[PDB]
Amino acid sequence: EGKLVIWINGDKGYNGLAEVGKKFEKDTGIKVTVEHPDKLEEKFPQVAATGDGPDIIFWAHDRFGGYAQSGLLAEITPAAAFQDKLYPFTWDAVRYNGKLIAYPIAVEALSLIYNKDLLPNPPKTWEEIPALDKELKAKGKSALMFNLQEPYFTWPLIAADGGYAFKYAAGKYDIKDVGVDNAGAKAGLTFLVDLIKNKHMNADTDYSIAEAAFNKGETAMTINGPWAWSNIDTSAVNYGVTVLPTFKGQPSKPFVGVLSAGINAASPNKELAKEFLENYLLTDEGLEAVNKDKPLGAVALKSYEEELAKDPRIAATMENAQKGEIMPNIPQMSAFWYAVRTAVINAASGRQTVDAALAAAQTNAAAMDMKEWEIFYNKIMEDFGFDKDKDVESAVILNNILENANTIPVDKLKDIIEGREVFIFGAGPSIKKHINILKELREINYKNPIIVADGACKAFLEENIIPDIIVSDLDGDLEALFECNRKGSIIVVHAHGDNIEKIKKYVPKLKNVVGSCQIPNYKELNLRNVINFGGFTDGDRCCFLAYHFKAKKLILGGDEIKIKKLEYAKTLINYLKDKIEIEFL
């Protein structure tokens, strides 16, 4: 690793980035290898978490906040002379918790691309597209085709009439205020699902299918970004780039991306990556070498944007950009994108209704997703030596057992845990002291939810306080638990590679059970009786649980492999201290 490895998406001008790398090698003899693996935004966090991966990563800024909170990105500290060369708003896109975590490259915004020969007057509104499609279908052509597998391309329509991802409240994105299932979101998605049902589009259209059909003159319109103009030029189709159509009188609001280059925190060539990006790529000569391969958009480098801003296609990119919103860079963006992706794919295929698709996305958009959990998960698994495959087998087993015996619906805990000051109790030393604080606090009518770890069951019975929820792996004294379970307590049973025995044993004899697993696949495994809210120990898992179900504020009242679990606990508890009030007792 005496050289530079660079990762950028396959739809970008990586050949042009290689040209810059060749010049870097020419002057410093440092070989530069540009790669474009599939799903690089998801592969990088995995390879980087261990110390592997490229030296420089390229992607829209929206993923970089999750990379930084995981500690995967070195902090960039360019001289003020260099920062002044880039627009300040592009720097803001890559600032996370006051630290710049990447170099901004170019502003990406989707635009409407139309065939002038097939359609010299592109439509101004979505509503008039169905009439245009049947009209074009009389000539063997379609009106519109674009990638329906990535929510990036359908979000402009979903957001036109009021849809939003996370409310921007008082200078901060409120991860609790998600707007993917409000009136506007449903309206936008419905119009898109109607387009499929009415045969104006196919739910199967993906990137390649849409690009092929448009560049072959089969469809009159597509929706894509500046990177796609290069292939359209080669296809000889006479195209134009214009403003996206309006929906219900309101403009389409595409999430605007800023292509950014992050430096791997484990890379041993940090200073080399710094000089390459600052002195080779982010120059008029360097950005253009990339731009002539595949257009970047509105570049962040001021000197080079003055020339591109004259291009009418770039003019439309910014007009569409000004009507949308720069994406957040917060770590929860990964969860939002998965939620919307699944909702669209499910509502498009008809396999699920628009109402239920968005309602499911609403829950899991703000819910912690297995993206910042992949980091903690495997870190804990090999640190203790747990068998990753056994966490699978136990999670699956737990699910099948709950399919036919004595379940409680998830939203009944949502009935308890919401807008309330939930009490979380571990088996700590001050349990009796803090339980005394709570009792005299509950004795005065401040009677709000109570979630307790397994080892605290008997510690609560003795004061005749029946916990509302109990998080347990069914390891120790189960008698105290069982008594609580029928006096009202809901039991959240957690799957453990070392607990598969007692799962099959004690579960069927319990009432009011909800499933838990640590495994991060499960959603892809399509397990519907278990859930991974996040967390390692019963204590911290209680916190993820209350958080997962929209709890206002947490209130807590609780051989090295015993000391090392208490560290992951505080590690994971501090993780949520920036997402929910966490007042200790």
Ligand X SMILES: OC[C@H]1O[C@H](O[C@H]2[C@H](O)[C@@H](O)[C@@H](O)O[C@@H]2CO)[C@H](O)[C@@H](O)[C@@H]1O
Q: Which is nearer to ligand X, 165 or 392 (CB)?
A: 165
435 three-state secondary structure: helix
* Rounded Cα distance, 78 and 424, in Å: 44
Q: Which is nearer to ligand X, 225 or 245 (CB)?
A: 225
* Rounded Cα distance, 474 and 496, in Å: 10
With binding defined as CB under 6 A, does residue 9 bind ligand X? yes
The distance of Cα 223 from the centroid of its chain, to the nearest Å, equals: 22
336 three-state secondary structure: helix
Q: Which is nearer to ligand X, 151 or 515 (CB)?
A: 151
Nearest approach, Cβ of 464 to ligand X (angstroms)?
50
Q: Which is nearer to ligand X, 114 or 152 (CB)?
A: 152
Candidates 78-86, 147-155, 245-253, 309-317: pick the segment binding ligand X (CB under 6 A): 147-155
The residue to which tokens 């439509």 are assigned: 123
Q: Which is nearer to ligand X, 201 or 459 (CB)?
A: 201
With binding defined as CB under 6 A, does residue 63 bind ligand X? yes
* Rounded Cα distance, 381 and 398, in Å: 20
Q: If DSSP states are collapsed to H, E and C, what string results for 345-377?
A: HHHHCCCCCHHHHHHHHHHHHHCCCCCCHHHHH
Which of 127, 150, 311, 475 forms a contact with ligand X (CB under 6 A)? Answer: 150
Q: Please answer whether residues 162 and 185 qualify as being in contact, where contact means their C-beta atoms are separated by less than 8 angstroms.
A: yes
Cβ contacts of 581 within 8 Å, gap of 6 or more = 552, 553, 554
* Rounded Cα distance, 356 and 177, in Å: 18
Cβ contacts of 425 within 8 Å, gap of 6 or more = 431, 434, 435, 450, 451, 452, 453, 456, 459, 460, 467, 542, 556, 557, 558
Q: Which is nearer to ligand X, 16 or 257 (CB)?
A: 257
With binding defined as CB under 6 A, does residue 297 bind ligand X? no
With binding defined as CB under 6 A, does residue 108 bind ligand X? yes
Phi–psi pair at 270, nearest 5 degrees:
-55, -45
With binding defined as CB under 6 A, does residue 262 bind ligand X? no
With binding defined as CB under 6 A, does residue 257 bind ligand X? yes
Nearest approach, Cβ of 150 to ligand X (angstroms)?
3
How buried is residue 409: exposed, middle or buried, by Cβ count under 10 Å (0-12/13-18/19+)?
Answer: exposed
Nearest approach, Cβ of 228 to ligand X (angstroms)?
10
Cβ contacts of 497 within 8 Å, gap of 6 or more = 386, 387, 390, 391, 393, 394
* Rounded Cα distance, 502 and 71, in Å: 37
With binding defined as CB under 6 A, does residue 182 bind ligand X? no
With binding defined as CB under 6 A, does residue 434 bind ligand X? no
Which of 91, 103, 337, 575 forms a contact with ligand X (CB under 6 A)? Answer: 337
Q: Which is nearer to ligand X, 152 or 533 (CB)?
A: 152
Nearest approach, Cβ of 357 to ligand X (angstroms)?
16
With binding defined as CB under 6 A, does residue 378 bind ligand X? no
Which of 13, 151, 184, 497 forms a contact with ligand X (CB under 6 A)? Answer: 151
Count CA atoms within 13 Å of residue 88 on its CB side.
Answer: 1
Nearest approach, Cβ of 338 to ligand X (angstroms)?
8
Instruction: Tell me, by CB under 6 A, how many residues bind ligand X.
Output: 13
With binding defined as CB under 6 A, does residue 319 bind ligand X? no
Candidates 144-152, 185-193, 440-448, 475-483: pick the segment binding ligand X (CB under 6 A): 144-152
Which of 14, 24, 91, 152 forms a contact with ligand X (CB under 6 A)? Answer: 152
With binding defined as CB under 6 A, does residue 62 bind ligand X? yes
Nearest approach, Cβ of 494 to ligand X (angstroms)?
30
Binding residues (CB under 6 A) for ligand X: these are 9, 11, 41, 60, 62-63, 108, 150-152, 257, 259, 337
